Amino acid sequence: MLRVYHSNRLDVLEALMEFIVERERLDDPFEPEMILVQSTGMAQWLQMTLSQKFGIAANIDFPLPASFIWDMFVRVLPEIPKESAFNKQSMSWKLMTLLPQLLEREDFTLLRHYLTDDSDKRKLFQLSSKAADLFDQYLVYRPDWLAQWETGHLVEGLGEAQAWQAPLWKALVEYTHQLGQPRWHRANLYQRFIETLESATTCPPGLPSRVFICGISALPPVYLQALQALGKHIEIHLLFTNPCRYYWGDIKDPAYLAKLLTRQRRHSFEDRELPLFRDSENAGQLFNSDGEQDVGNPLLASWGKLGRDYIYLLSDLESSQELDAFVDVTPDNLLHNIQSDILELENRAVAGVNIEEFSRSDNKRPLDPLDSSITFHVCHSPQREVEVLHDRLLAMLEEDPTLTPRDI
Amino acid sequence: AETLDPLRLPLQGERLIEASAGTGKTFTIAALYLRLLLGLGGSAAFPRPLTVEELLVVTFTEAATAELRGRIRSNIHELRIACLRETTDNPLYERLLEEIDDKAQAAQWLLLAERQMDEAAVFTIHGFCQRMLNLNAFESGML
Amino acid sequence: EQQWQAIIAEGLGAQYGDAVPLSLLRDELAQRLDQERISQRFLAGPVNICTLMPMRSIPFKVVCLLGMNDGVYPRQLAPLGFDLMSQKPKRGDRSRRDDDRYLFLEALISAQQKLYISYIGRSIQDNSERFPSVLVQELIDYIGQSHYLPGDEALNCDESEARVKAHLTCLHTRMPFDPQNYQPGERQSYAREWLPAASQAGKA
Amino acid sequence: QWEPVLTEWITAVLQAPLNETGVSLSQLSARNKQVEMEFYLPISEPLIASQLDTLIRQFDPLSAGCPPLEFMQVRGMLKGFIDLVFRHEGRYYLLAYKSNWLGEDSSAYTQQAMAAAMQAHRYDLQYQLYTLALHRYLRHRIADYDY
Amino acid sequence: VTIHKSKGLEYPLVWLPFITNFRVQEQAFYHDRHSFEAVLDLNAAPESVDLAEAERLAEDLRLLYVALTRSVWHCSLGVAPLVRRRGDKKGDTDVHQSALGRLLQKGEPQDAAGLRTCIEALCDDDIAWQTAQTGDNQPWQVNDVSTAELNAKTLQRLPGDNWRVTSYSGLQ
Amino acid sequence: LDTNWRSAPGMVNSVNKLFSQTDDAFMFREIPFIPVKSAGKNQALRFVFKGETQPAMKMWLMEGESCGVGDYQSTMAQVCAAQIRDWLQAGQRGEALLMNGDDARPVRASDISVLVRSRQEAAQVRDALTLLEIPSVYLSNRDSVFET
């Protein structure tokens, strides 16, 4: 069972992780606890909060999502090396050898005009590094393109660069077939990894008891389709921070809108069913013809496109369990007003479409002049900017008696 | 020579605008930017409306490009407000509002322009040349 | 030695047979030696000074933002031109512009008590107006269209928006020894070393 | 040239058992071993050296000499990196590595010289914090835990 | 502010004391009147010198227009019978070799009295002239005023307690 | 663009009178000059003195038959400094004003600007203006701070 934990802030997710660890203890003490993070400061803050909550924080592994996915590839499917043969530097050094061999082809006349003018083996290495970075991005994000390029068939609807990218990739796959290096990579393995977990009867050995995903707000659909097959057997708790409590993503089809309407979240402690949309009868009028929801808040619609795609990718999972733990914020300050307008998904920006809305101004929210929550400062130089910032931080430390510089 | 109207300029082929000293050149550039964004002019209009990432503005001085980008952003916000309210205090903005028949689609296009103003193609000469050399490096032969 | 042997091992893992020039290895070593970044003192207890890192949102009481002028933020990375992911975008695609906008959204949400935003508004060279980023401009537009001051209860919509945006904007002085900073009121400078210089009570 | 002496020195270290019953390192499986355990230890009280060194000297027998170090009041988190933790016959054990050893060349490294090195390098506080971290980890992980 | 640095700016009152000062270009680097390409003549041919001096005079006229069109309320010009030639009294002045004298004297070589009559010919309500009088009475008046009282804030307590995340090496 | 929104109509008429004396005043056939039109909202801009309304363009003709370069520069710098100190002396008493319709504004030190071409005559203007206790800034100063 894959559990999804929607929350407004990260302290509620840390308390939920504390309740999950204190509720279910690990049967193997030396088994490391996999918590997936993106940066080192996120893992450091998670270690500090778990040490402050439990009294200790040890044997907690913080790998990359790609490293954890390759480790699960090694543990589930055998005959796989510990390191991937298809890396950025390895594909760059392979393509630096393969690109002069492919200059005789007719499809590589553009690279021949780019390379054979003047080359002291500098443009070739930069081209190989950029093409290896693009091939790594194709290994992460676009496995069907590489799967069709390995056969030799083109994809309809792409650009002109595929005309030099399709024979370059396939001759790479033969090249590692020519050497002693293994064949397997990230693209061709994920489908067999998904199929071998659904087709299996018992759980494979070597898998961890529970995996946490905290601080990660962006994942490819390939990684989510692998993690769904992992969550079918082993309980994986997903901690995702979303600023809005309602549904603020996109839609695919009207047959998918009813499937999203049938799915309802439930609270962790209150245990009450809560719907996604604020209005169920008017939920069809919010989405456009292409499938984009007309969000009333312009800041959430203009800034959080990555989270808008990520909540649509999370809602697309079939066996996902969605739990919502949102702590409401009382709108008293300006910053709390902004956070309440984002969380409650309402539009407080008064346009003034009529003359009665344009003449009166008391229909907006009152802002006290002593409210120093959100301030905008205009500076003249980078020295004077942080010189003003130091004085303002000293004023904030003098105004609040209980204020830690670690919290700044 | 002929006089220049910002709402009657045919945006086809090559046109040469001679803006004298002291004239509102920075206002005329923003007016033509709004004209290219909304697709106005009728018979002398563009065949299709263009986005923010397709309008190229070339000015040599970098502070002039920053001031022009800020003025174009302010004009986009003012025209979005005047299109949402169907009224304005400027006569050129009044003729701009009178030239369009639809109000919701123009307001949505101006909102998308306000959201995509960060990715605007308002560069200098050498900046645009460096961007074209780095983007299409195959035909040029640039590192 | 470790970086040089790592470069040679990554080259020999592909079994490179042709000759390799010296300048390419020199540029590769210069790129690899400056690739490292340190984050050991990120949350040691002193106040954190760091750049915006993607997919990292931590709740704090006071969140300050520097360099929010236009051109600097959001950090724009031009595409390669021959990449096929930029031509046909999908759902799970990631770009640096959307990552920076989501980082600004996470910085707005993650602020608990106080949010500070500072940008270069006036040029130090020619005293030219430097416009801020589009995110901060949309933020102050939403503030001016969603809030009003109690002094002007019902005056106008645009005038109240301009009055709110002028009340929030604190245009600081160009020099630290200016006496406007030491004027008693809402803001006052904490620099005791520049107090007799700003008071103008010294001998020539 | 150091390699054929290095491999036989490594096998001579691994063949030597380090336990009160005589358990070697080759009897530890991969599930039992845990290398480089990183821990964070919280402390909310102001860490006074005078109130801590007397409590250490009350129980630790190696604190007969070793005049106390001077450090400021530390309130917050403490980082630590244990080298090896391994279980055997239902009993946990901690193992650390020290490898400087510049001043000895003969067989004089007896228990007295090692105790003098522990008192000089002040590894007693590190070992006591390691025991506290392992006690808190075994209390948090295994329910109904006895030290 | 120089003439090149005043392009696009705005000033209420503008004074141009050295608008009659000109410079003669010596090198022969011009542009063709048909192909519109840069022609550099390394030989000392007088035709190339005249064709470069024509472009120099056009650049001086453009500088004159740029310097004149920045004033809003009032502009003042300094006109004088400047002679670039080393002769003291030759009967002719070189103001026609400048940008202002090409518009005042209508592109004709004249004298100081001829330049004065060309100035006095185009007299309207907006265009006037006066003589240059050398004299000084008093420099200025400061009119100073007393500065307002001010003080600096003092931090009452410590900014933060001794919070640090250390290791064993930090405690040794 | 026919309309001019910056300057007063007197300065616009002075420019259209000076540059349209002959045909092709810029001496090139492909650069034509046209009479520009002033703005309707700025038609009441008047720089008034204590005596009467000062005209737009005032060509200060230096008296003499033939003069040098440095003496002419020094005399015109002294005349410009005298005009600056006269506009600042009468400007602080409410005599010399900038009037837009009924609105009036006193002339401060930032209003008067001297347009030079080189650095030598700029330093000459700065010295001849600081001789009469008038501080002046140089916007076109591109000198390095490491050379002082």
CSV table of N, CA and C in Angstrom, one decimal, chain C residues 99-196:
chain,number,residue,atom,x,y,z
C,99,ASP,N,11.3,25.6,-11.9
C,99,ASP,CA,11.9,25.3,-10.6
C,99,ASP,C,12.1,26.5,-9.7
C,100,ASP,N,12.6,27.6,-10.4
C,100,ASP,CA,12.8,28.8,-9.6
C,100,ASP,C,11.5,29.5,-9.1
C,101,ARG,N,10.4,29.4,-10.0
C,101,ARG,CA,9.1,29.9,-9.6
C,101,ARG,C,8.5,29.0,-8.4
C,102,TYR,N,8.7,27.7,-8.5
C,102,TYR,CA,8.3,26.9,-7.4
C,102,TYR,C,9.1,27.1,-6.1
C,103,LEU,N,10.4,27.4,-6.3
C,103,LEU,CA,11.2,27.8,-5.1
C,103,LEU,C,10.8,29.1,-4.5
C,104,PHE,N,10.3,30.0,-5.3
C,104,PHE,CA,9.8,31.3,-4.8
C,104,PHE,C,8.4,31.0,-4.1
C,105,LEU,N,7.6,30.1,-4.6
C,105,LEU,CA,6.4,29.7,-3.9
C,105,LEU,C,6.7,29.0,-2.6
C,106,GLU,N,7.7,28.1,-2.6
C,106,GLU,CA,8.0,27.4,-1.4
C,106,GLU,C,8.6,28.4,-0.4
C,107,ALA,N,9.3,29.4,-0.8
C,107,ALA,CA,9.8,30.4,0.1
C,107,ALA,C,8.7,31.3,0.7
C,108,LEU,N,7.7,31.5,-0.1
C,108,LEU,CA,6.5,32.3,0.4
C,108,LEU,C,5.7,31.4,1.4
C,109,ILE,N,5.5,30.1,1.1
C,109,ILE,CA,4.8,29.3,2.0
C,109,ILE,C,5.6,29.0,3.3
C,110,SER,N,6.9,28.7,3.1
C,110,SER,CA,7.7,28.3,4.2
C,110,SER,C,8.0,29.4,5.2
C,111,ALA,N,7.7,30.6,4.9
C,111,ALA,CA,7.9,31.7,5.9
C,111,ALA,C,6.7,31.7,6.9
C,112,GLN,N,7.1,31.6,8.2
C,112,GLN,CA,6.1,31.5,9.2
C,112,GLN,C,5.8,32.9,9.8
C,113,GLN,N,6.8,33.6,10.3
C,113,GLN,CA,6.6,34.8,11.0
C,113,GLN,C,6.8,36.0,10.1
C,114,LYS,N,8.0,36.2,9.6
C,114,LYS,CA,8.4,37.4,8.8
C,114,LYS,C,9.1,37.0,7.5
C,115,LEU,N,8.7,37.8,6.5
C,115,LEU,CA,9.3,37.6,5.2
C,115,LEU,C,9.9,38.9,4.7
C,116,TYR,N,11.2,38.9,4.4
C,116,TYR,CA,11.9,40.1,4.0
C,116,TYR,C,12.3,39.9,2.5
C,117,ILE,N,12.1,40.9,1.7
C,117,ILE,CA,12.5,40.8,0.3
C,117,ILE,C,13.2,42.1,-0.1
C,118,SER,N,14.5,42.0,-0.6
C,118,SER,CA,15.2,43.2,-1.0
C,118,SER,C,15.8,42.9,-2.4
C,119,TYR,N,15.7,44.0,-3.2
C,119,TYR,CA,16.2,43.9,-4.6
C,119,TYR,C,16.9,45.2,-4.9
C,120,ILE,N,17.8,45.2,-5.9
C,120,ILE,CA,18.4,46.4,-6.4
C,120,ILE,C,17.4,47.2,-7.2
C,121,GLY,N,17.0,48.3,-6.7
C,121,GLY,CA,16.0,49.1,-7.4
C,121,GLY,C,16.6,50.3,-8.1
C,122,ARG,N,17.7,50.9,-7.6
C,122,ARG,CA,18.3,52.0,-8.2
C,122,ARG,C,19.8,51.6,-8.5
C,123,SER,N,20.3,52.0,-9.7
C,123,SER,CA,21.6,51.7,-10.1
C,123,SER,C,22.6,52.6,-9.3
C,124,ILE,N,23.7,52.0,-8.9
C,124,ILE,CA,24.8,52.7,-8.2
C,124,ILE,C,25.7,53.5,-9.1
C,125,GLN,N,25.6,53.1,-10.4
C,125,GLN,CA,26.5,53.7,-11.4
C,125,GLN,C,26.0,55.0,-12.0
C,126,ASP,N,24.8,54.9,-12.6
C,126,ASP,CA,24.2,56.1,-13.3
C,126,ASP,C,22.9,56.5,-12.7
C,127,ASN,N,22.5,56.0,-11.5
C,127,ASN,CA,21.2,56.3,-10.9
C,127,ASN,C,20.0,56.0,-11.7
C,128,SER,N,20.1,54.8,-12.4
C,128,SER,CA,19.0,54.4,-13.3
C,128,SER,C,18.1,53.5,-12.5
C,129,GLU,N,16.8,53.5,-12.9
C,129,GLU,CA,15.8,52.7,-12.2
C,129,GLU,C,15.9,51.2,-12.7
C,130,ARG,N,16.1,50.3,-11.7
C,130,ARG,CA,16.2,48.9,-12.0
C,130,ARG,C,14.9,48.2,-11.5
C,131,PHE,N,14.2,47.7,-12.4
C,131,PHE,CA,12.9,47.0,-12.1
C,131,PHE,C,13.1,45.7,-11.5
C,132,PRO,N,12.3,45.3,-10.5
C,132,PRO,CA,12.4,44.0,-9.9
C,132,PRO,C,11.9,42.8,-10.7
C,133,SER,N,11.9,41.6,-10.2
C,133,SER,CA,11.5,40.5,-10.9
C,133,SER,C,10.0,40.5,-11.1
C,134,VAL,N,9.5,39.6,-12.0
C,134,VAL,CA,8.1,39.5,-12.3
C,134,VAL,C,7.3,38.8,-11.2
C,135,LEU,N,8.0,38.0,-10.4
C,135,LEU,CA,7.4,37.3,-9.3
C,135,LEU,C,7.1,38.3,-8.2
C,136,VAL,N,8.0,39.2,-7.9
C,136,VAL,CA,7.8,40.2,-6.8
C,136,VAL,C,6.8,41.2,-7.3
C,137,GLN,N,6.8,41.5,-8.6
C,137,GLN,CA,5.9,42.5,-9.2
C,137,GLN,C,4.4,41.9,-9.1
C,138,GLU,N,4.3,40.7,-9.4
C,138,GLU,CA,2.9,40.0,-9.3
C,138,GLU,C,2.5,39.9,-7.8
C,139,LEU,N,3.5,39.7,-6.9
C,139,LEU,CA,3.2,39.7,-5.5
C,139,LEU,C,2.8,41.0,-4.9
C,140,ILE,N,3.4,42.1,-5.3
C,140,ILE,CA,3.0,43.4,-4.8
C,140,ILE,C,1.7,43.9,-5.5
C,141,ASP,N,1.5,43.4,-6.8
C,141,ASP,CA,0.2,43.7,-7.4
C,141,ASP,C,-1.0,43.0,-6.7
C,142,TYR,N,-0.7,41.7,-6.3
C,142,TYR,CA,-1.8,41.0,-5.5
C,142,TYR,C,-2.0,41.6,-4.1
C,143,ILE,N,-0.9,42.1,-3.5
C,143,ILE,CA,-1.0,42.8,-2.2
C,143,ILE,C,-1.8,44.1,-2.4
C,144,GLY,N,-1.5,44.9,-3.4
C,144,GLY,CA,-2.2,46.1,-3.6
C,144,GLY,C,-3.7,45.9,-4.0
C,145,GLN,N,-4.0,44.8,-4.7
C,145,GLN,CA,-5.3,44.5,-5.1
C,145,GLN,C,-6.1,43.7,-4.1
C,146,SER,N,-5.5,43.2,-3.1
C,146,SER,CA,-6.1,42.4,-2.0
C,146,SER,C,-6.1,43.0,-0.7
C,147,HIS,N,-5.5,44.2,-0.5
C,147,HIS,CA,-5.4,44.8,0.8
C,147,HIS,C,-5.5,46.3,0.7
C,148,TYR,N,-5.9,47.0,1.8
C,148,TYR,CA,-6.1,48.4,1.8
C,148,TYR,C,-5.7,48.9,3.2
C,149,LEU,N,-5.3,50.2,3.2
C,149,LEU,CA,-4.9,50.9,4.5
C,149,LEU,C,-6.2,51.5,5.2
C,150,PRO,N,-6.2,51.5,6.5
C,150,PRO,CA,-7.4,52.0,7.2
C,150,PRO,C,-7.5,53.5,7.2
C,151,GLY,N,-6.4,54.2,6.7
C,151,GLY,CA,-6.5,55.7,6.6
C,151,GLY,C,-7.4,56.1,5.4
C,152,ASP,N,-7.2,55.5,4.3
C,152,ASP,CA,-8.1,55.7,3.1
C,152,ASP,C,-9.0,54.5,3.0
C,153,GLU,N,-10.2,54.6,3.6
C,153,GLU,CA,-11.1,53.5,3.6
C,153,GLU,C,-11.8,53.3,2.3
C,154,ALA,N,-12.3,54.3,1.7
C,154,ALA,CA,-12.9,54.2,0.4
C,154,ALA,C,-12.5,55.5,-0.4
C,155,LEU,N,-11.4,55.4,-1.2
C,155,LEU,CA,-10.9,56.4,-2.0
C,155,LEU,C,-11.0,56.0,-3.5
C,156,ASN,N,-10.3,54.9,-3.8
C,156,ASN,CA,-10.2,54.4,-5.2
C,156,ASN,C,-9.6,53.0,-5.1
C,157,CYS,N,-9.5,52.4,-6.3
C,157,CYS,CA,-8.9,51.0,-6.3
C,157,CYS,C,-7.4,51.2,-6.7
C,158,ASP,N,-7.1,52.0,-7.7
C,158,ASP,CA,-5.7,52.1,-8.2
C,158,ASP,C,-4.9,53.0,-7.2
C,159,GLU,N,-5.6,54.0,-6.6
C,159,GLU,CA,-4.9,54.9,-5.7
C,159,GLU,C,-4.6,54.2,-4.4
C,160,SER,N,-5.5,53.4,-3.9
C,160,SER,CA,-5.2,52.6,-2.7
C,160,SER,C,-4.2,51.5,-3.0
C,161,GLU,N,-4.2,50.9,-4.2
C,161,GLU,CA,-3.1,50.0,-4.5
C,161,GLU,C,-1.8,50.6,-4.6
C,162,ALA,N,-1.7,51.8,-5.2
C,162,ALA,CA,-0.4,52.6,-5.2
C,162,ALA,C,0.0,53.0,-3.8
C,163,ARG,N,-0.9,53.4,-3.0
C,163,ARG,CA,-0.6,53.8,-1.6
C,163,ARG,C,-0.1,52.6,-0.8
C,164,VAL,N,-0.7,51.5,-1.0
C,164,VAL,CA,-0.2,50.3,-0.3
C,164,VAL,C,1.2,49.9,-0.8
C,165,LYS,N,1.4,49.9,-2.1
C,165,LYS,CA,2.7,49.6,-2.7
C,165,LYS,C,3.8,50.6,-2.4
C,166,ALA,N,3.4,51.8,-2.1
C,166,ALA,CA,4.4,52.8,-1.6
C,166,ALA,C,4.6,52.8,-0.1
C,167,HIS,N,3.6,52.3,0.6
C,167,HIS,CA,3.9,52.1,2.1
C,167,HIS,C,4.7,50.9,2.4
C,168,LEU,N,4.6,49.9,1.6
C,168,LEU,CA,5.4,48.7,1.8
C,168,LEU,C,6.9,48.9,1.3
C,169,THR,N,7.0,49.7,0.2
C,169,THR,CA,8.3,49.9,-0.4
C,169,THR,C,9.1,50.9,0.5
C,170,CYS,N,10.2,50.5,1.1
C,170,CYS,CA,11.1,51.3,1.9
C,170,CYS,C,12.3,51.7,1.1
C,171,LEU,N,12.3,52.8,0.4
C,171,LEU,CA,13.5,53.2,-0.4
C,171,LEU,C,14.6,53.7,0.5
C,172,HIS,N,15.6,52.9,0.8
C,172,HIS,CA,16.6,53.3,1.6
C,172,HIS,C,17.6,54.2,1.0
C,173,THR,N,18.5,54.9,1.8
C,173,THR,CA,19.4,55.9,1.3
C,173,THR,C,20.5,55.2,0.5
C,174,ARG,N,21.2,56.1,-0.2
C,174,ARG,CA,22.4,55.6,-1.1
C,174,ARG,C,23.6,55.4,-0.2
C,175,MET,N,23.8,56.2,0.8
C,175,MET,CA,25.0,56.1,1.7
C,175,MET,C,24.6,55.8,3.1
C,176,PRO,N,25.5,55.0,3.8
C,176,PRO,CA,25.1,54.6,5.2
C,176,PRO,C,25.1,55.8,6.2
C,177,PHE,N,25.9,56.9,5.9
C,177,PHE,CA,26.0,58.0,6.8
C,177,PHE,C,24.9,59.1,6.5
C,178,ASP,N,23.9,58.7,5.9
C,178,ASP,CA,22.8,59.7,5.6
C,178,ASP,C,21.9,59.8,6.9
C,179,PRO,N,21.5,61.1,7.2
C,179,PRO,CA,20.7,61.3,8.5
C,179,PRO,C,19.3,60.8,8.4
C,180,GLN,N,18.8,60.4,7.2
C,180,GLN,CA,17.4,59.9,7.1
C,180,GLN,C,17.3,58.6,7.8
C,181,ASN,N,18.3,57.8,7.8
C,181,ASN,CA,18.3,56.4,8.4
C,181,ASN,C,18.2,56.5,9.9
C,182,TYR,N,18.8,57.6,10.5
C,182,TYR,CA,18.8,57.8,12.0
C,182,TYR,C,17.6,58.6,12.4
C,183,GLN,N,16.6,58.9,11.6
C,183,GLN,CA,15.4,59.7,12.0
C,183,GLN,C,14.5,58.8,12.8
C,184,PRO,N,14.0,59.2,14.0
C,184,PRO,CA,13.2,58.3,14.8
C,184,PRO,C,11.8,58.1,14.1
C,185,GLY,N,11.4,56.9,14.1
C,185,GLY,CA,10.1,56.5,13.5
C,185,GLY,C,9.9,55.0,13.4
C,186,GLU,N,9.5,54.6,12.2
C,186,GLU,CA,9.3,53.1,12.0
C,186,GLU,C,10.7,52.4,11.9
C,187,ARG,N,11.6,52.9,11.0
C,187,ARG,CA,12.9,52.3,10.8
C,187,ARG,C,14.0,53.2,11.4
C,188,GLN,N,15.0,52.6,12.0
C,188,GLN,CA,16.1,53.3,12.6
C,188,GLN,C,17.3,52.5,12.5
C,189,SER,N,18.5,53.1,12.1
C,189,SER,CA,19.7,52.3,11.9
C,189,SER,C,20.3,52.0,13.2
C,190,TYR,N,21.0,50.8,13.2
C,190,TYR,CA,21.6,50.3,14.4
C,190,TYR,C,23.1,50.4,14.4
C,191,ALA,N,23.6,51.2,13.5
C,191,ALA,CA,25.1,51.4,13.3
C,191,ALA,C,25.5,52.6,14.3
C,192,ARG,N,26.1,52.2,15.4
C,192,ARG,CA,26.6,53.2,16.4
C,192,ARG,C,27.8,53.9,15.9
C,193,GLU,N,28.6,53.3,15.0
C,193,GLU,CA,29.8,53.9,14.5
C,193,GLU,C,29.6,55.1,13.6
C,194,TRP,N,28.4,55.1,12.9
C,194,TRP,CA,28.1,56.2,12.0
C,194,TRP,C,27.1,57.2,12.6
C,195,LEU,N,26.9,57.1,13.9
C,195,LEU,CA,26.0,58.1,14.6
C,195,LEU,C,26.6,59.4,14.7
C,196,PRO,N,27.9,59.6,15.2
C,196,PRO,CA,28.4,61.0,15.2
C,196,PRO,C,28.8,61.5,13.8
